[PDB]
């Protein structure tokens, strides 16, 4: 469930 970076 790896999320992409947004910060």
């Amino acid at each position: 469930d790896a999320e992409f970076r947004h910060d």
Partner: antibody
Amino acid sequence: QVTLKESGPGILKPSQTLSLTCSFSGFSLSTSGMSVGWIRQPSGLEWLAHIWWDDDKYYNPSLKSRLTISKDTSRNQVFLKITSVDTADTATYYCARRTTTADYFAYWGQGTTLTVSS
Amino acid sequence: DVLMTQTPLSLPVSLGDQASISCRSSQSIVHSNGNTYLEWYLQKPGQSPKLLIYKVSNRFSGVPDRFSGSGSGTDFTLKISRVEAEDLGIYYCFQSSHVPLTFGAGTKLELKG
């Protein structure tokens, strides 16, 4: 004015390593919040890998074993390597930018065409 | 991977018609930070894709107001209020919440004859 420009070898033989470079102007990868990714369009669109101002790297898991992304902020360039190419890697390769304050692919390169063939 | 399913894959229209394209994701595009990173791109013949909409419904600067995006969770729509000839091309939805970042297959907006 922000621009990105991809360069590659044009043609490679199966089993060779693809070396792509993205050169850019009008911004710097050293800037906090900056990132650049690679997307290709095989003979729809497929995202490959992505790198951030702080050297954080993201890869498409199905392709990870063949991919390596890196940067040289001084040269203001980003690099992608794809090992062991085969005919399915024939595609147009794009680089595209995102930033934490404009978090979307607003700026793309024109693309570099690669043909892998014996 | 998050599968992005566009319906229809081919959309014949007459100039001036309203047009709508569905994008359904296999999982919610809501990110842990609360934003939904759903983008829409248009690719014209001999061009790189161009950004139309980001975060579901925010129109990118310079994009004509006949374009709009809506939806939430797993269900998204791109709407063109009146189709102009320059709008013909391939439309892609794209999610950047989850790795790998994934595009829909492309919907070709084409002319009725």
